[PDB]
């Protein structure tokens, strides 16, 4: 009611090996040449992927900068404010990056800062301009 385990005998295969005497040799040959094409194809990407692995030696270890270990403060120095307003113009609503630039303000009091100083610093005009890019 089912073939012995490991035997592969489906209707569709079997016509295709008996359409003519030659057919059985043919289908096997196509799989051989077809298998060879993948093997040729691999060793290109294996080579090309070996080229790119060399262009990436050293990694980026020379291009790294140390970590800013900076306790988050509460009050807003006038530079911290002015850093911010430029951050909004260059970043939009990406609060984390804006909270990185400033460094001692976390992401909530970024959000809070947009609230309280929205009129005072003419924010939305900045955002309008930031969207324009």
């Amino acid at each position: 009611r089912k073939p012995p385990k490991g035997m592969f005998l489906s209707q569709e295969d079997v016509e295709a090996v008996s359409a003519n005497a030659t057919a059985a040799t043919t289908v096997l040959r196509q799989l051989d040449m077809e298998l060879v094409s993948v093997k040729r194809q691999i060793q290109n990407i294996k080579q090309t992927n070996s080229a790119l692995k060399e262009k990436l030696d050293g990694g980026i270890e020379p291009y790294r900068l140390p970590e800013v270990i900076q306790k988050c403060n509460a009050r807003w120095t006038t530079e911290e404010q002015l850093l911010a307003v430029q951050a909004i113009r260059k970043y939009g609503r990406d609060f984390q990056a804006i909270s990185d630039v400033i460094g001692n303000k976390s992401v909530v009091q970024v959000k809070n800062f947009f609230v309280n100083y929205r009129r005072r610093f003419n924010i939305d005009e900045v955002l309008q301009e930031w969207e324009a890019e």
Partner: protein, 666 residues
């Protein structure tokens, strides 16, 4: 089984059920109350048990009733009807056995039997047992037909059939008790040796057999579940179904490899695409870091746009640095998913040259079993009789299987060197014209009521006809004759004078250089007390080796032997005999098979007897005058010695019913 149920089984009979051929003799019982049937079955069954318990002496009606018990021994007519039914169809009182009631003074009827092959002698003894006049015409100068034993000095070896394929339900079991013949069990262990001369290792040996067994089953799947039985209007042979199975599996290996390698290119394209994002990330980092170093050069105290552009670049560069590490970590995972795939590739090939060379040997054996290349066996039917197998170990005869036919011939009328050459069967009787083989001029005429024909299917097949049938056999017969298969298989008997093989091993095989010679000397037997090795030539090798002189065949045999046993340990043989069954005029082949396009229902057509036309037009349709027995006429048991014997028993029953009358069907 034991008890009376064992007697039924040992007679190839269901104990709990009543056979087609009991129904025809006992229609009153078949349509009767289910209780009378059971009566009958026990009334029967019991009787066979008494016969089997002591088959060396006649089982008379009186004795049977005497040992039957109430309530069974009441309806004496039923016991008469049963004991007559059995005796007549040779389920009891057949074989040798001392006769309680010696034969009638006057015989009735006259039957000529063509061939004292085993079927021939079986009918003959039975017909003679039944008060008839029997004469056997044998073209050979010896009896036994395909049962041929070679005896020289103390050397003994069958060139013919040499195995008893199990005593469970074997009538030969009865004969063994009757004719004492030394039966030796055959230790099934068989080790193969390649042409190089070195034993195949057990791991490969077990690995190969299982594939062959699995492959066979596969064909069955094709035949019965996928209706693979026609192809370009022709019938599929087992050989065709084997190639297409092997082919589909080879294909599937290639299918697996393509899936595995495609998985590789799927990852390599992801990896190659991932690298591109990492170069183009690094160069973005390269560029920014410059801008940061440059922007950092403006020295504090700087105005806050310049201060933004220092801190601003630092977030961007770090931002791209955390990217590049996630990318070089996705790299990490995919760079090991790639050595996983290299670590676990699929199987190289379905089968290598060494494998197919051992799998040839398993096909050789199958060709030996069927005496024919597998390209001829019908896919659907080659194993139709593979259900009536006898149980038990297979066995050989240590004293020559020739003793059985010789025992049967005792007290029968046999004309040796008598080649029947024309059979004339008429409404009023038959005459058989036979000549003398020694001198062909001498001509003989034999007149008779019926003629029983145990001519091998090979002799029956021959063009031009070895034997003329006048009137000709009807098309329904002759066409059954062309459809069936008569195969070939030959043996070489190696007669040495030292014992140099593993004595504890009965049989061991040689593996062929090539598919085309897979049958060529592929297997040997140490069956005999004397130092005798015996070697088989089956499959396509069979018919070809008949064109080669003994000394060449013997030379090749020794070479295979030397390579396996050491070139010094293998003496010259003292006597050598090679068989040519296909060449043999009285056989024209070895035994039969179910050729592609035939069926077990040809074997039935072969048994149907021929009733000739009326002598004078308007005369009533007569008696059937010509009947047929022998290995190729019994459907459930062809190509064996027991099968031929049962057909003999069959016809003696059928003959007697037609000419002596059936007085057990009231």
């Amino acid at each position: 089984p034991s008890g009376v149920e064992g007697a039924a089984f040992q007679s190839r009979l269901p104990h709990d059920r009543m056979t087609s051929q009991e129904a025809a003799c006992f229609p009153d019982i078949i349509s009767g109350p289910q209780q009378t049937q059971k009566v009958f079955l026990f009334i029967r069954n019991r009787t066979l048990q008494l016969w089997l318990d002591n088959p060396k002496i006649q089982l008379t009606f009186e004795a049977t009733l005497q040992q039957l018990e109430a309530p069974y021994n009441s309806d004496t007519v039923l016991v008469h009807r049963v004991h007559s039914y059995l005796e007549r169809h040779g389920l009891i009182n057949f074989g040798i056995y001392k006769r309680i009631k010696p034969l009638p003074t006057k015989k009735t009827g006259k039957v000529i039997i063509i061939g004292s092959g085993v079927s021939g002698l079986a009918a003959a003894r039975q017909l003679q047992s039944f008060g008839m006049d029997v004469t056997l015409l044998e073209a050979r100068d010896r009896v036994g037909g395909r049962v041929a034993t070679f005896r020289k000095g103390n050397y003994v070896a069958d060139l013919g059939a040499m195995v008893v394929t199990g005593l469970g339900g074997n009538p030969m079991a009865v004969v063994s008790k009757q004719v004492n013949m030394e039966l030796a069990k055959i230790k099934q262990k068989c080790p193969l040796y390649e042409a190089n001369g070195q034993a195949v290792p057990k791991e490969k040996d077990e690995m190969v057999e299982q594939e062959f067994n699995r492959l066979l089953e596969a064909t069955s799947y094709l035949s019965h579940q996928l209706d693979f039985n026609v192809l370009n209007n022709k019938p599929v042979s087992l050989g065709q179904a084997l190639e297409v199975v092997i082919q589909l599996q080879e294909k599937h290996v290639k299918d697996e490899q393509i899936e595995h390698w495609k998985k590789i290119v799927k990852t390599q394209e992801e990896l190659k695409e991932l690298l591109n994002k990492m170069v183009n990330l690094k160069e973005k980092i390269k560029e920014l870091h410059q801008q940061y170093k440059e922007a950092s050069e403006v020295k504090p105290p700087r105005d806050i746009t310049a201060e933004f552009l220092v801190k601003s670049k630092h977030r961007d560069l770090t931002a791209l640095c955390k990217e590049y590490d996630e990318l070089a970590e996705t790299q990490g995972k995919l760079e090991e998913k790639l050595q996983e795939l290299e670590a676990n590739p699929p199987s190289d090939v379905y089968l290598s040259s060494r494998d197919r060379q051992i799998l040839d040997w398993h096909f050789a054996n199958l060709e030996f079993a069927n005496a024919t290349p597998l390209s001829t066996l019908s896919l659907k039917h080659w194993d139709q009789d593979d259900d009536f197998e006898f149980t038990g170990s297979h066995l050989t005869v240590r004293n020559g299987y020739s003793c059985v036919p010789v025992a049967l011939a005792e007290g029968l009328d046999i004309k040796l060197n008598t080649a029947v050459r024309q059979v004339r069967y008429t409404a009023s009787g038959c005459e058989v014209i036979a000549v003398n083989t020694r001198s062909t001029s001498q001509t003989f005429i034999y007149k008779c009521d019926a003629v029983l024909c145990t001519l091998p299917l090979g002799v029956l097949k021959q063009q031009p006809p070895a034997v003329q049938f006048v009137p000709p056999l009807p098309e329904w017969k002759t066409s059954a004759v062309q459809r069936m298969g008569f195969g070939n298989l030959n043996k070489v008997v190696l007669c040495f004078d030292r014992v140099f093989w593993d004595p504890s091993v009965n049989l061991f095989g040689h593996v062929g250089s090539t598919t085309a010679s897979r049958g060529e000397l592929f297997l040997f037997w140490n069956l005999y007390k004397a130092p005798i090795l015996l070697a088989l030539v089956a499959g396509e090798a069979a018919g070809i080796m008949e064109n080669i002189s003994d000394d060449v065949i013997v030379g090749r045999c020794l070479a295979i032997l030397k390579g396996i046993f050491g070139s010094s340990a293998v003496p010259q043989p003292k006597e050598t005999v090679v068989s040519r069954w296909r060449a043999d005029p009285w056989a024209r082949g070895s035994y039969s098979y179910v050729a592609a396009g035939s069926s077990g229902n040809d074997y039935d057509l072969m048994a149907q007897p021929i009733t000739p036309g009326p002598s004078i037009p308007g005369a009533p349709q007569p008696i059937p005058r010509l009947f047929f027995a022998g290995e190729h006429t019994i459907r459930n048991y062809p190509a064996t010695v027991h099968g031929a014997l049962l057909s003999g028993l069959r016809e003696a029953g059928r003959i007697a019913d037609q000419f002596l009358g059936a007085m057990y069907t009231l």
